[PDB]
Ligand binder design. Structure first.
Ligand SMILES: CCCCCCCCCCCCCCCCCC(=O)OC[C@H](COP(=O)([O-])OCC(O)COP(=O)([O-])OC[C@@H](COC(=O)CCCCCCCCCCCCCCCCC)OC(=O)CCCCCCCCCCCCCCCCC)OC(=O)CCCCCCCCCCCCCCCCC
Ligand SMILES: CCCCCCCCCCCCCCCCCC(=O)OC[C@H](COP(=O)([O-])OCC[N+](C)(C)C)OC(=O)CCCCCCCCCCCCCCCCC
Ligand SMILES: CCCCCCCCCCCCCCCCCC(=O)OC[C@H](COP(=O)(O)OCCN)OC(=O)CCCCCCCCCCCCCCCCC
Ligand SMILES: CCCCCCCCCCCCCCCCCC(=O)OC[C@H](COP(=O)(O)OCCN)OC(=O)CCCCCCCCCCCCCCCCC
Ligand SMILES: CCCCCCCCCCCCCCCCCC(=O)OC[C@H](COP(=O)(O)OCCN)OC(=O)CCCCCCCCCCCCCCCCC
Ligand SMILES: CCCCCCCCCCCCCCCCCC(=O)OC[C@H](COP(=O)(O)OCCN)OC(=O)CCCCCCCCCCCCCCCCC
Ligand SMILES: CCCCCCCCCCCCCCCCCC(=O)OC[C@H](COP(=O)(O)OCCN)OC(=O)CCCCCCCCCCCCCCCCC
Ligand SMILES: CCCCCCCCCCCCCCCCCC(=O)OC[C@H](COP(=O)(O)OCCN)OC(=O)CCCCCCCCCCCCCCCCC
Ligand SMILES: Nc1nc2c(ncn2[C@H]2C[C@H](O)[C@@H](COP(=O)(O)OP(=O)(O)OP(=O)(O)O)O2)c(=O)[nH]1
Ligand SMILES: [Mg+2]
Lengths: 98, 320, 459, 99, 54, 58, 345, 53, 48
């Protein structure tokens, strides 16, 4: 369990670093966001199952539901960007600088 | 009760109060060709509210006592001075154009508010959609400059798409020599000092630019004078006119409510007409603005909000 | 002190409720009554200090400043009556309110027993001077001048606030008399040196010290007459009062931290007197004369002799009165000719004999004519400075020589000589402005007659 | 050119009101403001206040200190005491440190 | 002194310094990619200060 | 005589969104005041002697 | 929007920070944070323009990254301590990541690069909603764990927040960007006073909110997006320039306005805790903030910028727009300084 | 009608009376050392109850 | 009849006036009663 939890935290760190280093695809950014979400789900579930915390096993269900609604909101925003610009390229999102 | 979201919740639905004759009809034409009489007869025999051409003193007549104010309060622009000398160095032409566009915008807001509140249709004379015709005519005649044209286009882009286009646009096609003959027969000595080049620019701006942009989104009703000068066939066409295009079909109750708020607050209507674009034609200095604003404030009935001016007979000021 | 603060506070509803044809009359008469009421603080029949309450007090140093402010307020209204005659009623009442706010907040500032309350009222007085200069100033440089004045003063005043809070945390109450009684010596360490600089530089900016004096000439030039009065006659002396109040808890290291500021003050009054010689603007020339006089005040306060403190006090009052009179005469000439050029109006002795007489007495008070309180201040400052070091007399002599030269150069090029006959728009005199000069000059004569009132704390 | 009011010219105020006193345009407010400034400036402030200041007694106890000085000089001269002691404080009631 | 060097020394020098700093610090290109790269640098820096502070 | 008030020049130095046009920021424009058909051309056919150029909105 | 979704969206916007403040669980404070974010996003994209879409996208990705970092910290604390609350012995790395992500949510520097851009392009009332309401919940989470945080990291974040906010507000012209960097500087002040006295943090937050509300109401009176637009306010609404000047001077912290009280008591407490250099630098950057405020005052009130010709017609029209609680918040944000012992606790 | 026209002339004297009243209130508030200063510690006269009011 | 349009504040809102006046009166009476009750409670608690 400590080795696998360390691997899960490094997976979250890699997904976070991928989120922070943008590429041309906002879809890829959202996919990195759900890489973080999935890593959070596995760490929470393994922690609850290891600690036998039956009172807190609803917490993975709540993080899944809340993050899924948040990503639905983000997908709607990406749909709006793709509609206004043809593509989802993040460098098209830059006219609020001035 | 003032109109608002609470009134919309309790029930003030525009689509509920709509009927067949709840239409926006705009009559357009050249300077002197039967435009006023036809609109009056159409409104009278259709049961519609007639809005004549918004002049310089439209805001003066619609606000306060309704008497026309002084010229320095109402735009400081003279149509007679423009006719006498259109290329004057003080920028009378573009000041007159911007003031008339603001008056037309206020008139369109008033007509839209009346239609959305009472359900009665409106018949306007030469609304905001056909004032760029005068703009382009003065630009092609050299009366104004490209900076004035750009500023007018910017204001039109700021204000125009926030409202709804008219349901019907009835146009009066008329030859320039006929317009010249009617102008000579009218007898206004300033108005005979207009050029056939300017009239042809107006007519060309109409035919080349105004009629198509009405054509793909509303119903266009070009008539001659002889097709006009009898306000029965035109009303018959209005009766047998089908409105199956434009953004009026996509409007629902809450869009009507938000549009009603926009047209019922006049400050949001005239918000973008006072953008800080400093053209020397329309820029007024601090001292002249101070004097004009102050004198408008000691004008009777204009010192405080309406209903709070004791000099005009308003009562219960202390209690409200 | 409340019996002076409250009716000055109630001047504001009188201003905003008076008729537009009675506002100036009512406010001027009642502010004259405010000055008459404020004269009761001179009832000092004992060595004890007039501690009116736990928050306000009167002092032999604070009392002349309060009386001076209460006296200048009706004079301020008189000077502001003319250039606002073509102005809106609401803005006129607003300007009167701004002046009354100056007068109220300055009385509370001088009468405060707490240094933190003194600081709050310090830049609480800074705000309406900014508003007056920025709104009712004439030229286009008033905005820049307001920026310069405000930011010199605030960059000065922030380390003063930090020093005040540190002193409060170290001692416990920051009450002026408690500090004066349980004053503790300093260890002459670097922290104490920086603390001394922090609590000194705010009042040094407000004085202004030489090198940092650049906000004063442009603010005085682009300011209106009431702003010029309030600056040159109250605010510099307010910085003076701040140093006098704060210097008690700064022993012993002020005896060597006084060194750069004394040199700066002496060489700077020489420098600014030279600028007064070669200055082409009358308001600028009077402003630089004010800088030189406050440099003398710096030298006295920093050498910290009791005779020097007295000379600083009498120079505060005398220079405030004579600088206000000089700015009034300059503003009368400015309202005549619509120009500020030093050389443009020359032969005014002919057309305006009584105003030229007022010019002459104002300049004679400026150049330290005996037996005036001006010369008493400069002579006692001279005596204390020579006691501090015998070679200061050379700089004092150069300063006095150039002072006489710029005062007589003022008189010669503004009154004497041939008249500029092209200025046909020369109205003879206003009884208002002649009364303004008389009300400026008579208290100078009375304080010359009795100089014991403005001697200050030391004697 | 932007619209702007022309530069006003200051008028000869004495042309329409030869008895102008500097305070207000019409004669009545001008003369009453002049009277108010004269009566409240010189009459009941520069004279009544001057009298009050002149008749403040014993201002910071110069007169009392003079009387006490004369009394102390008389005391110390009829009893042979020094006029001023070299030490303000009595040396017996001060505990100096041992080093 | 007054019209050249004290002006060049205290106020205009302070104004020029703050103008240069505000231009340099808000010459932002407006790209969320650059902003998130900056955020990553901030994260790395704060981890470094935590590791050296302990 | 009269108090100076800002002209068109002093009013126009306050537009440009920057206050400080440098070489790396002078190309910027101020924001607008109001802060402001692709359709299917299907070819129906070999489901086959019919061609349909069919213009679809969804 | 119809009133049904208007009520639902406003109720969830209200409910998010309420759950965050009322909740004693890290999980529930988290879920309140995304109630606030998710409910406010349609309100940003309400206007349906490319600038609003840009602001909504940047705001979403920033808050999503910060919320995932917050959940990382919560899960790591849950593993390390077996509970759902940073009690006393949670890891300093976890606490620093929590502070990192809450500072990212707040928009204080060097995580401030999105706040002026998100504030731009959205309507003024949404700028007010963001810059006032969206910060109480991250401040609530920060206040709940004050003795555990790292003073060095907080002081660095705070001083650079005031530096970048002062420099930005000095730089631009746009009203929304000016208010955003003003928010960044004020959050720097609140963050700096956070580890020593959270009561003064709450006091500064309430003072900033009651100063930000009448700014945004005054901007919404004429939709003045620009320094020039608020500069011709004398022709539009001359009865407001006095309160504009007073409230902007209060935002600058000039006495005797009540906006001097938060900076004053914060400096006093910081000097009680002996961080004199930090307090001096904070006060100098506050002077820079006051400089751009004073330039704004010069533009809008003390001078009179030239006007247009249609402003005559706009003065011909009447208005009932300004609400009743504008004056109450204005007076409470200007003339409350003698009630300082009552305002502080 | 004279009281209606010249009602503005009582505000400053009313403020003066109020300021004198507040000075009197502060004076009776600061009475913790009345007849207790060692410079002025004297036995009370039978016709008086306080040294100063 | 001066204005061409009927003003919103042409007539006083009588319901608003009555509610405001009654509210101010109610808070004044409640303030006096609570102040007297607080004085009596403080004296009873401290034995005054
Ligand atoms: C008195 C002082 C306080 C006044 C507050 C009200 C202000 C106001 O509304 O003024 C308008 C109104 C006058 O208006 P008006 O002339 O009738 O007509 C309006 C115009 O038509 C309107 O025309 P317009 O709007 O078209 O154009 C005008 C417009 C045009 O705009 C401009 O001209 C712009 C000007 C920009 C420059 C100025 C910027 C702001 C500067 C403010 C001061 C800052 C420095 C001061 C020190 C720091 C302060 C924090 O605005 C102005 O000119 C300025 C308007 C505001 C002026 C009054 C400002 C008062 C506050 C500041 C002074 C007092 C406090 C500080 C000093 C305190 C003592 C040290 O003022 C009053 O009526 C004042 C009150 C007088 C009666 C008092 C009665 C008291 C009764 C007590 C008993 C009953 C209550 C008991 C309570 C307790 C029970 C237990
Ligand atoms: C208008 C003048 C502007 C320039 C001069 C400004 C003042 C210079 C002298 C004071 C230092 C700076 C202000 C500190 C205020 C508090 C002082 C104090 O309490 O000292 C004792 C304290 C020490 O406190 P202490 O006494 O407790 O020391 C500890 C002692 N033991 C351990 C024994 C108990 O000194 C400081 O803390 C000073 C640190 C200051 C660091 C920050 C300085 C920033 C820059 C300041 C100037 C910025 C504006 C000008 C920029 C250039 C413009 C052209
Ligand atoms: C750690 C921080 C630095 C990581 C550098 C990774 C490589 C890099 O610089 O990628 C830049 C690239 C920018 O995005 P792109 O759209 O490709 O831009 C075109 C390039 N002008 O960025 C990307 O495309 C995103 C890359 C994300 C990578 C995530 C996984 C990184 C794994 C390696 C970590 C670093 C290892 C360093 C080893 C050094 C030698 C021992
Ligand atoms: C403008 C002109 C500036 C230079 C003026 C000429 C030199 C003045 C030198 C001086 O002030 O010396 C005083 C003092 C001498 O040193 P000393 O008395 O031994 O102090 C022990 C401190 N540990 O020196 C010191 O204590 C050292 C620090 C002196 C700081 C004086 C103020 C500097 C300028 C502030 C503006
Ligand atoms: C304190 C801070 C001030 C700040 C600025 C204030 C500005 C506003 C001022 C408002 C009024 C305040 C006046 C303050 C000065 C008062 C002057 C005064 O009367 O001083 C008293 C002095 C008497 O002298 P004394 O006080 O005893 O001291 C000298 C001995 N140690 O008196 C004198 O020596 C003479 C008094 C004045 C001169 C006489 C005037 C009347 C002359 C009438 C002559 C009539 C004809 C002859 C009659 C017969 C004579 C035998
Ligand atoms: C002998 C003693 C020697 C020691 C003492 C020295 C200090 C004395 C007191 C300091 C006085 C500083 C005066 C600063 C204001 C004067 C400069 C000015 O007015 O700049 C104006 C300019 C903006 O001009 P603008 O209006 O945009 O355009 C011109 C016309 N439209 O403005 C700009 O371009 C930018 C202005 C920025 C704001 C300036 C005021 C605040 C300065 C804060 C300084 C903080 C220092 C510490 C920083 C942290 C440590 C590094
Ligand atoms: C303790 C913390 C309490 C909450 C502090 C933060 C509150 C932030 C503002 C929330 C509400 C903002 C809002 O709804 O804005 C839209 C509205 C537009 O104004 P308008 O359409 O005229 O409606 C007013 C009708 N009379 O604008 C308004 O109605 C403005 C309402 C501002 C309320 C500020 C309250 C501050 C705290 C007391
Ligand atoms: C710290 C500060 C604490 C107190 C903050 C709130 C102060 C009172 C706010 C309420 C208020 O003043 O209400 C007055 C208002 C007047 O109503 P009116 O202007 O006639 O509007 C009707 C338009 N049809 O009346 C109403 O809105 C209705 C009557 C009062 C209802 C409560
Ligand atoms: N320059 C300019 N003149 C305008 C504008 N709108 C109207 N006018 C002029 C044209 C006419 O000379 C005058 C009156 O407008 P009309 O078009 O209604 O003319 P008239 O009433 O004589 O004829 P009618 O029978 O109504 O068509 O105002 C405008 O936008 N610009
Ligand atoms: Mg017509």
């Amino acid at each position: 369990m400590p080795s696998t939890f360390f691997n899960l935290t490094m997976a979250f760190s890699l997904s976070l670093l991928g989120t922070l280093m943008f590429r041309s695809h906002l879809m890829s950014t959202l996919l990195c966001l759900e890489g973080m979400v999935l890593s959070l789900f596995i760490m929470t579930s393994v922690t609850s199952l290891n600690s036998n915390s039956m009172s807190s096993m609803p917490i993975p269900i709540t993080i899944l539901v809340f993050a899924a609604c948040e990503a639905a909101v983000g997908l709607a925003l990406l749909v709006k960007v793709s509609n206004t610009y043809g593509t989802d390229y993040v460098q098209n999102l830059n006219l609020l600088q001035c | 009760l003032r109109y608002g979201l609470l009134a919309a919740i309790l029930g003030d639905k525009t689509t509920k109060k709509l009927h067949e004759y709840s239409r926006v009809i705009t009559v357009d034409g050249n300077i002197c060709s039967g435009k006023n009489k036809l609109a009056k007869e159409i409104a009278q025999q259709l049961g519609m509210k007639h809005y004549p051409e918004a002049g310089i003193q439209y805001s003066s007549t619609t606000t306060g006592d309704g008497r026309p104010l002084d010229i320095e309060f109402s735009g400081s622009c003279s149509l007679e001075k423009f006719y006498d000398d259109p290329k004057s160095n003080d920028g009378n032409s573009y000041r007159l154009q911007s003031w008339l566009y603001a008056s037309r915008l206020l008139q369109y807001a008033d007509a839209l508010e009346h239609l959305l509140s009472t359900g009665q249709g409106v018949v306007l004379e030469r609304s905001i959609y056909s004032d760029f015709v005068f703009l382009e005519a003065m630009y092609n005649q050299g009366y104004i400059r490209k900076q004035c044209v750009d500023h007018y286009n910017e204001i039109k882009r700021l204000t125009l798409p926030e409202y709804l286009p008219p349901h019907a646009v009835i146009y009066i096609d008329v030859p320039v020599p006929e317009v010249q003959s009617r102008i000579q027969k009218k007898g206004d000595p300033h108005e005979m000092k207009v050029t056939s080049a300017y009239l042809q620019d107006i007519e060309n701006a109409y035919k080349k630019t105004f009629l198509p942009k009405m054509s793909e989104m509303c119903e266009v009703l070009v008539y001659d004078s002889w097709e006009a000068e009898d306000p029965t066939k035109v009303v018959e066409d209005i009766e047998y006119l089908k409105y199956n295009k434009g953004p009026w079909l996509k409007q629902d109750d809450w869009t009507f409510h938000y549009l009603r708020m926009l047209v019922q607050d006049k400050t949001e209507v005239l918000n973008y007409t006072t953008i800080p674009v400093y053209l020397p034609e329309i820029t007024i200095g601090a001292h002249q603005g101070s004097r004009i604003y102050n004198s408008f404030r000691e004008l009777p009935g204009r010192k405080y909000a309406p209903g709070y001016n004791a000099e005009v007979g308003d009562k219960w000021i202390w209690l409200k | 002190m409340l019996k002076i603060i409250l009716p000055s506070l109630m001047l504001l509803p009188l201003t905003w409720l008076s008729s537009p044809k009675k506002t100036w009359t009512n406010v001027t008469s009642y502010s004259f009554l405010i000055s008459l009421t404020s004269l009761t603080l001179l009832w000092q029949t004992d060595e004890n200090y007039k501690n009116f309450s736990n928050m306000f007090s009167s002092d032999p140093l604070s009392t002349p400043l309060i009386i001076l402010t209460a006296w200048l307020l009706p004079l301020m209204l008189m000077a502001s009556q003319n250039h606002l005659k073509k102005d809106n009623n609401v803005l006129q009442k607003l300007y009167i309110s701004m002046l009354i706010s100056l007068q109220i907040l300055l009385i509370m500032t001088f009468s405060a027993t707490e240094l933190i309350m003194f600081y709050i009222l310090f830049e609480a007085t800074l705000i309406p001077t900014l508003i007056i200069i920025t709104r009712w100033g004439n030229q286009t440089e008033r905005l820049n001048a307001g920026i310069y004045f405000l930011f010199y003063t605030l960059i000065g005043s922030i380390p003063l606030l930090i020093a005040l809070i540190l002193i409060q945390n170290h001692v416990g109450t920051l009450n002026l008399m408690i500090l004066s009684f349980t004053t503790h010596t300093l260890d002459a360490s670097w922290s104490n040196n920086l603390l001394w600089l922090a609590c000194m530089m705010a009042f040094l900016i407000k004085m202004p010290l030489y090198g940092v004096h650049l906000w004063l000439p442009k603010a005085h030039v682009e300011a209106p007459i009431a702003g010029s009065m309030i600056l040159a006659a109250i605010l510099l002396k307010l910085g003076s009062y701040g140093m006098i109040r704060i210097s008690i808890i700064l022993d012993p290291l002020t005896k060597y931290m006084a060194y750069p500021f004394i040199l700066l003050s002496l060489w700077g009054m020489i420098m600014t007197s030279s600028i007064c010689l070669r200055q082409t603007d009358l308001k600028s020339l009077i402003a630089y004369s004010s800088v030189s006089h406050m440099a003398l005040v710096i030298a006295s306060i920093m050498i910290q002799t009791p005779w020097s403190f007295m000379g600083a006090t009498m120079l505060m009052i005398a220079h405030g009165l004579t600088s206000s009179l000089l700015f009034c005469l300059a503003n009368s000439n400015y309202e005549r000719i619509h120009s500020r050029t030093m050389i443009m109006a020359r032969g005014l002795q002919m057309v305006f004999p009584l105003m030229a007489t007022w010019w002459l007495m104002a300049s004679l008070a400026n150049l330290a004519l005996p037996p005036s309180i001006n010369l008493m201040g400069e002579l006692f400052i001279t005596m204390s400075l020579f006691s501090w070091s015998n070679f200061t007399i050379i700089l004092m002599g150069i300063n006095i020589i150039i002072t006489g030269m710029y005062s007589m150069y003022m008189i010669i090029t503004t009154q004497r000589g041939k008249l500029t006959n092209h200025m046909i728009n020369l109205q003879p005199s206003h009884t208002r402005e002649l009364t303004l000069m008389a009300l400026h000059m008579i208290p100078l004569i009375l304080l010359t007659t009795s100089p014991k009132l403005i001697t200050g704390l030391t004697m | 050119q932007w619209q702007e009011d022309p530069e006003p010219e200051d008028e000869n105020v004495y042309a329409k009101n030869p008895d102008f006193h500097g305070y207000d345009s019409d004669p009545v407010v001008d003369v009453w403001n002049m009277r108010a400034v004269f009566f409240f400036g010189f009459s009941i402030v520069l004279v009544f206040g001057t009298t009050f200041v002149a008749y403040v007694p014993d201002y910071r106890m110069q007169e009392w200190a003079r009387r006490e000085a004369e009394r102390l000089v008389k005391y110390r001269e009829v009893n042979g005491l020094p006029i001023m002691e070299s030490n303000y404080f009595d040396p017996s009631k001060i505990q100096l440190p041992e080093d | 002194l007054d019209l050249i060097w004290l002006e060049k020394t205290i106020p205009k020098s302070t104004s020029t310094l703050h103008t240069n700093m505000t231009t340099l610090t808000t010459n932002q290109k407006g790209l969320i990619k650059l902003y998130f790269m900056s955020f990553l640098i901030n994260i790395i820096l704060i981890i470094i200060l935590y590791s050296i502070n302990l | 005589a009269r108090q100076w008030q800002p002209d068109i020049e002093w009013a126009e130095q306050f537009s440009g969104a920057v206050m400080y046009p440098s070489k790396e920021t002078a190309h910027w424009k101020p924001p607008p005041w109001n802060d402001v058909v692709t359709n299917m051309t299907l070819n129906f056919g070999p489901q086959g002697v019919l061609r349909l150029v069919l213009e679809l909105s969804g | 929007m119809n009133p049904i979704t208007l009520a639902i969206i406003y109720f969830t916007i209200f409910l998010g920070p309420v759950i965050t403040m009322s909740s004693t669980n890290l999980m529930l404070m988290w879920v309140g944070l995304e109630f606030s974010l998710l409910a406010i996003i349609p309100m940003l994209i309400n206007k349906k323009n490319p600038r609003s879409t840009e602001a909504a996208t940047k705001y979403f990705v920033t808050q999503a990254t910060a919320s995932m970092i917050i959940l990382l910290a919560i899960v790591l604390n849950y593993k390390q301590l077996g509970t759902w609350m940073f009690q006393q012995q949670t890891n300093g790395l976890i606490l620093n990541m929590t502070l990192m992500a809450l500072s990212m949510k707040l928009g204080l520097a060097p995580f401030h690069f999105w706040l002026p851009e998100v504030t731009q392009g959205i309507p003024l009332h949404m700028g007010l909603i963001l810059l006032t309401w969206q910060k109480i919940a991250p401040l609530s989470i920060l206040i709940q764990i004050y003795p555990l945080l790292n003073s060095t990291i907080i002081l660095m974040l705070a001083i650079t927040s005031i530096f970048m906010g002062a420099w930005g507000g000095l730089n631009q012209t746009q009203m929304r960007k000016i208010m955003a960097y003003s928010s960044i500087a004020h959050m720097g002040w609140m963050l700096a006073i956070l580890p020593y006295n959270p009561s003064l943090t709450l006091l500064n937050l309430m003072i900033y909110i009651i100063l930000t509300a009448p700014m945004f109401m005054a901007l919404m009176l004429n939709n003045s997006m620009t320094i020039n637009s608020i500069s011709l306010l004398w022709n539009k609404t001359p009865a407001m320039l006095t309160m504009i000047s007073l409230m902007l001077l209060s935002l600058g912290g000039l006495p005797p306005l009540t906006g001097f009280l938060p900076k004053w008591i914060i400096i006093t407490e910081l000097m009680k805790n002996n961080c004199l250099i930090m307090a001096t630098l904070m006060a100098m950057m506050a002077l820079l903030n006051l400089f751009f405020y004073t330039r704004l005052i010069y533009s809008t009130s003390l001078t009179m910028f030239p006007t247009n010709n249609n402003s005559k017609m706009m003065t011909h029209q009447t208005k009932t727009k300004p609400n009743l609680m504008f004056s109450t918040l204005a007076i409470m944000s200007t003339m409350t300084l003698p009630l300082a012992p009552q305002l502080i606790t | 009608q004279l009281l209606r026209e010249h009602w503005v002339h009582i505000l400053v004297p009313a403020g003066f009376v109020f300021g004198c009243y507040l000075d009197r209130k502060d004076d009776e508030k600061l009475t913790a050392f009345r007849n207790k200063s060692m410079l002025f510690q004297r036995e009370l006269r039978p016709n008086e109850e306080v040294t100063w009011k | 009849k001066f204005y061409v349009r009927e003003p919103v504040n042409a007539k006083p809102n009588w319901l608003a006036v009555g509610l405001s006046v009654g509210a101010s009166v109610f808070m004044w009476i409640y303030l006096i009663q609570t102040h007297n009750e607080d004085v009596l409670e403080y004296k009873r608690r401290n034995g005054l």
